[PDB]
Each structure stands twice: as structure tokens, then as C-alpha cells.
Ligand binder design. Structure first.
Ligand SMILES: [Zn+2]
Lengths: 133, 133
């Protein structure tokens, strides 16, 4: 059928590597690009097409208990092992990530409708904000 | 509140570049990570936490009419300029991407609840399959 309208979720991606290498995309980018699963949204009106494609990768699982030390392998970032410990400070969840990097950790808290996550490493602070679906 | 349960969508990410650089993440990775939007699913039972995080980025937004050649800038892959012409062959969309690369194009068709996208560059063929959601 000529009807391609709809939302489509990638289930297989054979030889993405060879196609990308043929397109002269550098290996470091190809290694990342094969990990993510594409979603395609097609809006079709006769012979007129709109195609919006995004791609998603899975970062990590992290399971923990407040007050219990745990090894965190940061596979979605720098691929290091840290000994993490999460504690409450009021309503703020505070994590110290013990390891090679000095002053590494994060803070996580709710402010009404929004989740705030502050990541630190050395003198660098990254501030993230999330909203509910 | 200490209740962080929920599906949290990133709306802001300040200085993720500087944080990643402090972690010695190399530029090839930082340049894609900086334009991802995270989805954080938190399941929390008292002091026990599970956090599943994914990240999504844009790939392409194409708008075309069958039979009308259009200019395409392949930002999601090699960022080249091609002149794309899409025609029907039966119920298969067939595209030639005229440009610097030889024998570049793609075919796109439906079978059942699946969408097939065959991408070709030179002697390399990538076969993607998508399931209708
Ligand atoms: Zn990706």
C-alpha cells in the first residue's frame, strides 16, 4: 500500500555500520549511532510526505538504597567506577561519587512540579531541570 | 517533598559540556550528548530507588512531494547537500540522492504492519525495519 502514515519504531538496522562508513562518518560517531533506536513519524497527504525521525538510546539503570554504598559504573558517561553513597539532606537527595575525580557527585530535589538535578565534577556544575509527563 | 516518583522529561540542561569535559569525555561523544533530551523514570519506595534514564535526539525532518526534486541537507548522517527525487515504483518509494557520493539513495515500503527502509551508498546497503506503533 502507498499509505505510509503513522508512527514507526525501529526493530532492526542491518549494516548501519557499512552504510555510515561509506558516507564517511567517523568511527567514533558510528559507534554511538548504532546504539540508538529510531522512531519515525510520517504525516502523509497524498503524494506529500512529512517525515520526522528521532533516535533514542538507553543510558543506564541505577538502583540504590539511601545510606547504602554501591558501585556505580558510569557506562553512559565516562566509563568509570565510583563508590556512590546517597543520603537525604532535608528533601534533597545528595550523592557523593568516590573515585578518581575530585568533588564528584550530584544533588536531586523536587520543587513543586519540577525535578532539579545538579551534577558536579571538580569546578564544573551542570544544572538540569525536568518536568512531569 | 521527598516523592520523586514519576516520568520526568528534561526541559533544561546547563553546562553539560563543561561537566563532560571535566570527566575527560572526548569531543565526538560530547557533541552528540549535548543535544540529547533525557527521559527519567523513577520508581521510589521509601529509601529504595530505581532510575531508568533514556536520551533522545533529533535526526531529520524531511518534507517532500513525490515527483518533485528537492534539496536535502543530511544533517543526521554526513551533513552533505543532495538533490533528492522520490518516485513511486508500485507501492515502493524510490529515491535517488544526486550529489558528491556515487549510487546514493533509498527505498521505502510497507508490508503488513512493518515499514522497510533500504539505504544505499556505493556498494553498501543498510536494511532497516520498523514496526507500526
Ligand atoms: Zn544516537
Amino acid at each position: 500500500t502507498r499509505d505510509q502514515n503513522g508512527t514507526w519504531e525501529m526493530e532492526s538496522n542491518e549494516n548501519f555500520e557499512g552504510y555510515m562508513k561509506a558516507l564517511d562518518i567517523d568511527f567514533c560517531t558510528r559507534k554511538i549511532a548504532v546504539r540508538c533506536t529510531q522512531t519515525k513519524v510520517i504525516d502523509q497527504d497524498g503524494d506529500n510526505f512529512k517525515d520526522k525521525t528521532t533516535s533514542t538510546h538507553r543510558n543506564y539503570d541505577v538502583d540504590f538504597t539511601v545510606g547504602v554504598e554501591f558501585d556505580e559504573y558510569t557506562k553512559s558517561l565516562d566509563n568509570r567506577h565510583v563508590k556512590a553513597l546517597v543520603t537525604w539532606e532535608g528533601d534533597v537527595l545528595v550523592c557523593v561519587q568516590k573515585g578518581e575525580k575530585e568533588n564528584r557527585g550530584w544533588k536531586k530535589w523536587i520543587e513543586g512540579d519540577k525535578l532539579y538535578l545538579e551534577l558536579t565534577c571538580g569546578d564544573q556544575v551542570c544544572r538540569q531541570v525536568f518536568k512531569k509527563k
